[PDB]
Amino acid sequence: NFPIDEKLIREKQNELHIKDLGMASIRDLVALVTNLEKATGTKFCRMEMGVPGLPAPQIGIETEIQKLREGVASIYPNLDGLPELKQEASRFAKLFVNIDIPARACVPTVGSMQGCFVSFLVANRTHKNREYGTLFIDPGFNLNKLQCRILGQKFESFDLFEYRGEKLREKLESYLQTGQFCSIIYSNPNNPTWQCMTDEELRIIGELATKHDVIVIEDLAYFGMDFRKDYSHPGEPLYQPSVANYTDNYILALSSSKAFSYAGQRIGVLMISGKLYEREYPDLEESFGRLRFGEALSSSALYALSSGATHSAQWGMAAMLKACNDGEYNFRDSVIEYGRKARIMKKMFLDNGFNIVYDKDGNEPLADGFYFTVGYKGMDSSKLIEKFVRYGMCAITLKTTGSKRNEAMRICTSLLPESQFPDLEKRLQMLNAEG
Template identity: 45%
Template sequence: MDAGAVPFDRSRIGRILDSTGFDPANLSIRETNRLVTLIEQELNVRFVRMEFGVPNLPYDPIGVETAGRIEAERQASAQYPPFDGIPELKREASRFIANFLDLDIPPECCVPTVGSMQGGFIAQAIAGYRLPGRDTILYLHPTFPVSMRQTRFLGLGLDSIETADFRGPALLAEVERKLSGGRIGGLLYSSPNNPSWIALKEEELRGLGELCTRHDVLAIEDLAYLCMDFRQDYSIPGRPPFQPTIARYTDRYFVLISSSKIFSFAGARIGIAAFSPAFLKMSAPALVPRFGTANVGHAFVHGGVYCTTSGVPQSSQWGLVGLMRKANAGELDFVAATREYGRRAATLKAIFRRHGFRLVYDNDLGEPLADGFYFTFAYPGMSGQQLMLALLHYGLSAITLESTGSRRGEGLRACVSFVDAAQFPLVEERLACFRRDHPLPEEPAAARSARSGGGVQ
């Protein structure tokens, strides 16, 4: 497989797309990923792949091995894991949360889940069914598309706010307006945000927490990209600054922590759902028909984890024990490792801008947006769908912002994880060809002519 001259054969790409049966106006992440793989195989070409938000850094093998993965297989391979997690992981997760979020959440409230997606699924179900008539999840958009699919799968309502349009006091006012309607059971968001990479400020989280308490709404905080706002140094355990979190300002929260991005431990499919100790005493009779209990904390473990996966495999749990244990001891600087994503994003943003693209989300409450796992871009005169399909012919793949719930319909989301320094020249070359074939309206004829004949500039 080689890079291949661009643009690729349009008719062949069209036939491949037709053969999949996918709707080009509504491609999911997985469908885009599958389509690009088919094009690569059929045309024997290599894409610059930015559609899939998966990690691509080496994980720490010592942390996993010394944790007892082999020990787990030797001693526990014939035993089911506890539904609420092995004690060693619950203790390390509680310590990890204290060290990096400055929260005192007891081990009893730290539950391993099959990825943070399972934690989010159960949290949404509890938030949406806990109080009669409060069956809608309010999203701070944009968001991870599959979270919205979970909401619909659960039969819950979905409402949203475009976060970039309402920051600071305006965000709090808009959230309060929505909560005052009496339909909202849960507030769901990620910070740093997938895909905009906006990071909510401490004062915003304080206000959101107070609103959740006042209106009895459960916050579902997705920290898949924990400590990855690289404008701050969150790398030293037990020392400020700490990852901002709503859990400091309300006792109505689920905090979802993923091992995939921060530890590059995605194949193990394990995360931690940490919930408020208040849930251990909170009663919600409306949960009984679905969860078999009115106790919110018990509902998460026995009504949620037990009836969906019956727990997380012991080998994955032991692996995460080792990673968290080393991070807690200051022996594994996972923040330093993930800074590589920020470096890649900074370079790729500059390349895209050089070739006429603009960043869709580029401001974070008056500050320049951080460089991280994702960035968003657009090209003048094209919708997001048009741009996504056009870039396929130039060996570049991304997903539309519309699929994330964003109201920025002109943009795409790019994940930087699979684009390393060796591919930067290829990105430069392909974007130069794209701009040659799609000149900007304001470019003078001489510039267009020079660009079409000159290759990479």
């Protein structure tokens, strides 16, 4: 039972060489909890993994199976990507984002992580006279910083907490007006906070990207997952909001991993502004041997990175997008379950002494979705994560996300089974009773 012995916890941390639990890597945190579950015979409420909790859509799976039987495993995918995937991604951009993006400029990638890597690789080499590459609108996804670091590309970042709405203009522009940046990246909906960039904010970002001639990489990993609206019906409003409505300098990264529960197949698509795709950048020639942005990215960089994405997986994604386009599959009907879980879980935290840290978009309360953030009496997250583990819960801090809200933890709603909800509530009660 709870709380778990303090000595046992120290011992298991020492075994893993963990000095500050708030900075432990995800694999070390997972190993710690797994070791504690075994040592104590308890099952933790594990809320730390931002991964799919739903099965892959049958349309995807069955298409891969059919295509493997037809012979695609022995055939290299086309240099520019599977034509069907490029075409359905183009249709998807129109039917779900209302953006006109040609199939030519829709590029299959090995997940949005390869999509981000190549975007940084090319976008941050567009202007050799600029000292920096990406401006990060954090809290964000730390692997993206590692990508830039691996590329040797300097970057800057700021925590969006104090700069929402019209306040975003002066803050973004403080960096862009140095003339030293090439790109901007953010996720919407956001990992880790679940904030959704408003149309006011997207207009500010787009206007400034055009003014300062920088490229916006918009990470739509949690596609259409702001459940306060319904973005799931093709060809009619509402549509997923996008910076593409406010600038021509954009790359829209679409992953299959979250909205299509397809993380294992490593397949995504970059939907690149058509005008950007054709734009001639002399500074790309030395390293890529292409002048046009899109050719440098797709024909040179991606080809060199992996010579395409898994052929069966390209078909799986094409089939899933087509089904959405055609009105035969509603992607939101399954993933909205995460929001239903969030509504329940948020209330358990708030009933037991917690507050939502990143709590609003404009005046709208935070959506119920895949993640939310919590704090407990402003205590440092390094202390709160220890308190979680003592009470058989696991979640991550925001310490490596660029957030300056040192009290914040990220709660994920995906894997925790509803059958463990009674245990989560009891544990939160016990945690709050200790105080």
